[PDB]
Amino acid sequence: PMFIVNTNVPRASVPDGFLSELTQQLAQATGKPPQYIAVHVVPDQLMAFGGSSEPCALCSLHSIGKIGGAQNRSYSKLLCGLLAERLRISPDRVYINYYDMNAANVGWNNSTFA
Amino acid sequence: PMFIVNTNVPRASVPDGFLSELTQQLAQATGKPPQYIAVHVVPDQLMAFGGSSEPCALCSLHSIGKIGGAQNRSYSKLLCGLLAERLRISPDRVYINYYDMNAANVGWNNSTFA
Amino acid sequence: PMFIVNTNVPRASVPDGFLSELTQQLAQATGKPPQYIAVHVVPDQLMAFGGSSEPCALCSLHSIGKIGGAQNRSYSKLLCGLLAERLRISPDRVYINYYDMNAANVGWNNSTFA
Ligand SMILES: CC(C)c1nn2ccccc2c1C(=O)[C@@H](C)N
Ligand SMILES: [Cl-]
Ligand SMILES: [Cl-]
Ligand SMILES: [Cl-]
Ligand SMILES: [Cl-]
Ligand SMILES: [Cl-]
Ligand SMILES: [Cl-]
Ligand SMILES: [Cl-]
Ligand SMILES: [Cl-]
Ligand SMILES: [Cl-]
Numbered sequence: 001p002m003f004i005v006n007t008n009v010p011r012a013s014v015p016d017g018f019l020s021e022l023t024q025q026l027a028q029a030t031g032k033p034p035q036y037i038a039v040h041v042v043p044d045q046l047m048a049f050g051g052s053s054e055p056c057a058l059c060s061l062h063s064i065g066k067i068g069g070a071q072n073r074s075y076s077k078l079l080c081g082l083l084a085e086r087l088r089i090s091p092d093r094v095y096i097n098y099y100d101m102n103a104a105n106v107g108w109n110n111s112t113f114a
Numbered sequence: 115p116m117f118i119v120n121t122n123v124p125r126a127s128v129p130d131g132f133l134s135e136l137t138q139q140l141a142q143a144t145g146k147p148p149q150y151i152a153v154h155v156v157p158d159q160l161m162a163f164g165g166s167s168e169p170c171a172l173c174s175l176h177s178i179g180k181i182g183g184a185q186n187r188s189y190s191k192l193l194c195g196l197l198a199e200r201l202r203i204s205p206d207r208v209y210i211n212y213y214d215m216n217a218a219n220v221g222w223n224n225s226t227f228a
Numbered sequence: 229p230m231f232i233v234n235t236n237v238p239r240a241s242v243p244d245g246f247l248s249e250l251t252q253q254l255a256q257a258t259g260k261p262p263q264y265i266a267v268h269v270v271p272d273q274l275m276a277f278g279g280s281s282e283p284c285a286l287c288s289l290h291s292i293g294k295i296g297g298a299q300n301r302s303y304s305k306l307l308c309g310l311l312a313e314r315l316r317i318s319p320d321r322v323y324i325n326y327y328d329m330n331a332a333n334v335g336w337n338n339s340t341f342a
């Protein structure tokens with residue numbers, strides 16, 4: 001799986017250990033092996049949500065399977081929870097796009113998961 | 115909806131009110147409330163379009179519905195128009211990927227839109 | 229086509245002409261004219277792969293057609309090879325998401341490719 005978070009929150013406000021916490025929480029939530037988890041955080045971004053530039057975040061979670069109605073609601077609660085707790089971003093100022101990737105469309109180690 | 119613009123144009127060349135203009139114009143174009151419109155601009159990028167690093171832009175517009183053949187053509191005219199006017203980027207050096215998202219695949223406020 | 233590389237490797241480590249090499253290599257691989265190839269490299273990113281902060285990369289390749297099982301395996305070998313030789317990133321620490329875009333969903337020059 002791959003989780004990306006883009007936010008206008010400054011770098012200095014992203015607490016130490018955030019990438020590790022995301023990796024650990026996502027491994028368990030998705031059920032995927034920790035070695036399969038990739039995380040990416042992009043702070044200090046120029047963005048707005050509803051026209052307001054108060055703290056907000058635009059994210060994406062890509063996974064081969066483990067994507068669905070119920071699972072996505074659970075990931076959203078988990079992720080919005082972490083963003084609220086660690087980056088002080090209100091859950092209603094966070095969007096998370098979920099993508100269920102076909103194995104044939106994910107490259108890794110000179111090949112694909114197909 | 116969510117609109118992201120990645121460009122090699124420097125931050126100082128992004129005029130005041132750009133995020134606000136995009137928010138307003140996209141709310142009107144998509145027919146969605148501006149409160150639900152998120153915009154993100156990423157300047158000073160290392161990119162090339164067609165083998166040259168002259169001003170260019172790689173963008174994405176995600177929306178639950180309001181995506182289609184005719185609508186996308188209309189959005190492209192609007193967006194390329196804004197990028198040319200405000201960032202001086204030639205329309206033929208702009209790519210905009212459109213994504214019609216299923217409500218279950220868009221997280222927000224500890225849940226999804228499903 | 230559009231190729232994006234997000235990586236934690238330093239900007240100073242990205243060889244000059246790297247964008248040009250990616251452009252020409254992708255033009256050859258996809259069979260499409262270099263004029264239509266866009267490349268984007270984002271260094272100095274805060275990311276982790278498998279919980280580790282060692283060099284890694286999260287990439288995407290979007291193309292109208294020329295995407296598939298066999299082709300993607302070929303693209304992965306090509307791209308991982310380039311990232312390894314030029315950016316010193318191990319292939320097993322690289323993810324590449326492939327997207328076969330419908331022409332109606334790719335905006336360009338005030339319209340779409342449909
Ligand atoms: C699905 C499988 C190919 C696979 N994907 N993947 C992604 C990141 C790290 C390890 C692996 C991995 C493996 O364990 C191989 C060695 N069997
Ligand atoms: Cl589910
Ligand atoms: Cl897919
Ligand atoms: Cl602005
Ligand atoms: Cl140039
Ligand atoms: Cl339409
Ligand atoms: Cl039309
Ligand atoms: Cl979707
Ligand atoms: Cl194929
Ligand atoms: Cl093959």
Ligand SMILES: [Cl-]
Binds near residue numbers: 328329330333
């Ligand atoms: Cl598409």
